[PDB]
Design a protein around this ligand. Structure first.
Ligand code: FZK
Ligand code: FZK
Ligand code: CA
Ligand code: CA
Ligand code: CA
Ligand code: CA
Ligand code: CA
Ligand code: CA
Lengths: 428, 428
């Protein structure tokens, strides 16, 4: 959610910044709705005052006929309820516009139309030269009998996988290593979170109202018919960021650094034809998430810190990658600034996204009413939120299998993972 | 699913065994439906033969007027379709009865009406005598700030939890230890499975048709409108057992021993008032599952082996427990024989179920069409399936926290878990 006072004092300036994302702000409709709102608001508050006054006239006349007065109060009560209902409809209409507005891109963000306009910031490692024909992770998984897409189609449907044996163990070892790295070395606190969340949570991090169709929704439970309209989490960012919803945090307690390993459930729109085979785009994928809750003046430094934390995973695993600054046209809804880490994928002869690290500024904090305060301060302010993959576990497995494959199809276990695999050097 | 030939040759004998579970088999309705079925089946097959014959008469007369013949064939085609539809309705009616029938209890199972009739088989360990007032895991979790039910109500709703910090780490350490024990010592193969499954899978393990209301169901996806009616898994038993659906396994490849660590999603009926506070009964809980696919003559020995595997977790963790043989009236739908392991819960002054180990016999194998064959054999036979918790992770955490609590509220880390906690002796 953008600052509503900033959508009042500077609507054309806000529209200019948003146009860089390729978003057209309906400034004229917002202005016409706001003008009709001020009219209904005065009319409504005048009715609230006179109803309040007429009811007080009854209560005091009861001590000293209360029938002509009780009739008037009920007529006014009906008029106020109608005016309040008419007002609420207009407020819901303003909300539909306001809550579909993406975040204002920060001045640090390069201007661009799409991903082909993204700026490379750095590159680490050298992609391996092979002495044989590179096999993809799908072929390698079939050779080991460890990645089974057919068994998952039978169990569920498309865009699911069954991992069996040592390759399943390796996937677990990756998540164990990532969580240990962030909690032991990077100052993050571990969390076990719910994988089903409510509407409030989804509005809080921006999945609602605009991206309902990208989620798996659950039907309400018989015993909880009016309080169980849930959706599966598309990322641990959703439950983790919402832990500070409706909180006033003492500034001394900031930064709040949280991590979680969860499955992620998505039904991303128009992906039909893009990455048809393999683990890159799945309905269910594991991800180790890093979330930061910080003071407004520390969010830019926190973005560099958190990106470095994701980079460390790739570096320790010896996976070559490139760090990319996303342009205005390729950023996610909530982000004001994003870096994507793209890992070398040998069978694809390119770098593929494995992490997205964002500074959300106060956009989610505004929706969640998440604020901070120094103990002295007469006023509170909205916190800044940040999130980043450290990393997407299935995509790490893709990268690991392909970069560490041997001529016979054996998978060399990266050195840092060997303590997580009982010192095993190779799978196969 | 029970053997349909056994529901024909011995319906009163099957009814007698089922009455011990407190299930009344409608033998009279099953007989009346079966008699009407034989009538419609003869009528239908006679129509299939004559339609087939009349169509062949056209094709051969076309070489040597095909209009009076094509008219007759279309009239017969309409009659056959009607008869086939009438027959299918009766088959669906027989299925509704047949698929709601629980498994026949094995003769080893003691006769009883409910859980108060269950027989204790063994007891291991001595419940700890405390020098202070025992705190429950909910109080201990609040003291450590590690178990937060309020944050989960805010994120989702009731019967969810947020675990924070060292207690979240401990929960992860429990699952890591259980998986390592079963894959390293007990001969199980690790699996990463889907947490969303289809109708076929749910019918395969017996959740459908009778227990639909105990599941979280997802609404179909826009891009997969006719093939995405899924439900969240209530146990890894559902995807794991279904991996052998429509398979003929070479008997030399048996036993197939699989393990998986997954969240489990349930909305169990009439639980309102039972275990209102804490981790014992949750909508989302982690569980390390053991599944065995075996030859029909080895399932009874496999049940003892698998129960011993679950017992080993409790023994290594130094958690006192009791092993209980469930009576006919307390067994789950699919089971023919079950042992429950009940762990000592100090704040409750009793043993609480932490594992349920069952021999399913051929009940799921029949629904899944999962069979085995010796390479010589002219005939295949249905495999036997077994499943057992090793263990329910949240309930292990309840037991661990309560049995290992110190006077100040610190949690002593069990010796076997310390390598999983970087040698940490105590939390706090
Ligand atoms: N909370 C933030 C940061 O993690 C977030 O979710 N951003 S993201 O870019 O949508 O997703 C975070 C990461 O998840 C992976 N991913 C995505 C889709 C898919 O089908 N499979 C994947 O493995 C991608 O590598 C991506 O960089
Ligand atoms: N597949 C088989 C064997 O694991 C099965 O699911 N059996 S069971 O008894 O339904 O569930 C297996 C185990 O799951 C735990 N449980 C159950 C309900 C709940 O709300 N929370 C829990 O922790 C119980 O301790 C139980 O022994
Ligand atoms: Ca501090
Ligand atoms: Ca992106
Ligand atoms: Ca974001
Ligand atoms: Ca063998
Ligand atoms: Ca039971
Ligand atoms: Ca069972």
């Amino acid at each position: 959610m953008l600052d509503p006072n900033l959508l009042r004092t500077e609507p054309d300036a806000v529209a200019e910044k948003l146009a860089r994302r390729g978003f057209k702000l309906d400034v004229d409709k917002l202005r016409a709705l706001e003008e009709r709102r001020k009219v209904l608001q005065v009319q409504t508050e005048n009715l609230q005052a006179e109803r309040n006054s007429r009811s007080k006239s009854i209560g005091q006349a009861k001590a000293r006929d209360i029938e002509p007065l009780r009739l008037e109060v009920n007529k006014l009560g009906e008029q106020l309820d109608a005016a309040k209902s008419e007002l609420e409809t207009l407020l819901a209409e303003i909300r539909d516009i306001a809550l579909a507005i993406p975040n204002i891109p920060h001045d640090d963000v390069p201007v661009g139309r799409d991903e082909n306009d993204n700026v490379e910031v750095s590159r680490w490692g050298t992609p391996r030269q092979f002495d044989f024909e590179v096999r993809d992770h799908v072929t390698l998984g079939e050779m080991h009998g460890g990645l089974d897409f057919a068994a998952a189609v039978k169990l569920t449907g498309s865009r699911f996988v069954v991992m069996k044996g040592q390759l399943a163990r390796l996937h677990r070892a990756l998540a164990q290593f990532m969580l240990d790295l962030h909690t032991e070395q990077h100052g993050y606190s571990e969390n076990y979170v719910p994988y089903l969340v409510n509407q409030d949570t989804l509005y809080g991090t921006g999945q609602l109202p605009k991206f309902a169709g990208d989620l798996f929704h659950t039907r309400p439970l018989e015993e909880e018919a009016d309080s169980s309209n849930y959706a599966l989490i598309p990322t641990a960012e959703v439950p983790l960021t919402n832990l500070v919803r409706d909180e006033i945090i003492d500034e001394d307690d900031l930064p709040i650094k949280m991590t979680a390993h969860t499955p992620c459930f998505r039904s991303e729109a128009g992906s039909y034809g893009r990455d048809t085979r393999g683990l890159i785009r799945m309905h269910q994928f594991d991800k180790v998430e890093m979330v930061q809750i910080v003071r407004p003046e520390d969010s830019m430094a926190a973005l560099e810190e958190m990106t470095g934390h994701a980079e460390k995973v790739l570096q320790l695993l010896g996976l070559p990658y490139r760090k990319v600054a996303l342009c205005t046209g390729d950023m996610g809804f909530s982000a004001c600034k994003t870096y994507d880490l793209e890992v070398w994928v040998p069978a694809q002869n390119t770098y593929r996204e494995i992490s997205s690290c964002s500074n959300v500024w106060d956009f989610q904090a505004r929706r969640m009413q998440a604020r901070c305060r120094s103990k002295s301060d007469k006023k509170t302010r909205l916190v800044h939120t940040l999130n980043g993959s450290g990393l997407a576990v299935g995509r790490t497995l893709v990268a690991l299998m392909e970069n560490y494959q041997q001529a016979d199809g054996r998978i060399e276990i990266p050195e840092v993972l060997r303590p997580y695999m009982r010192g095993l050097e190779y799978i196969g």
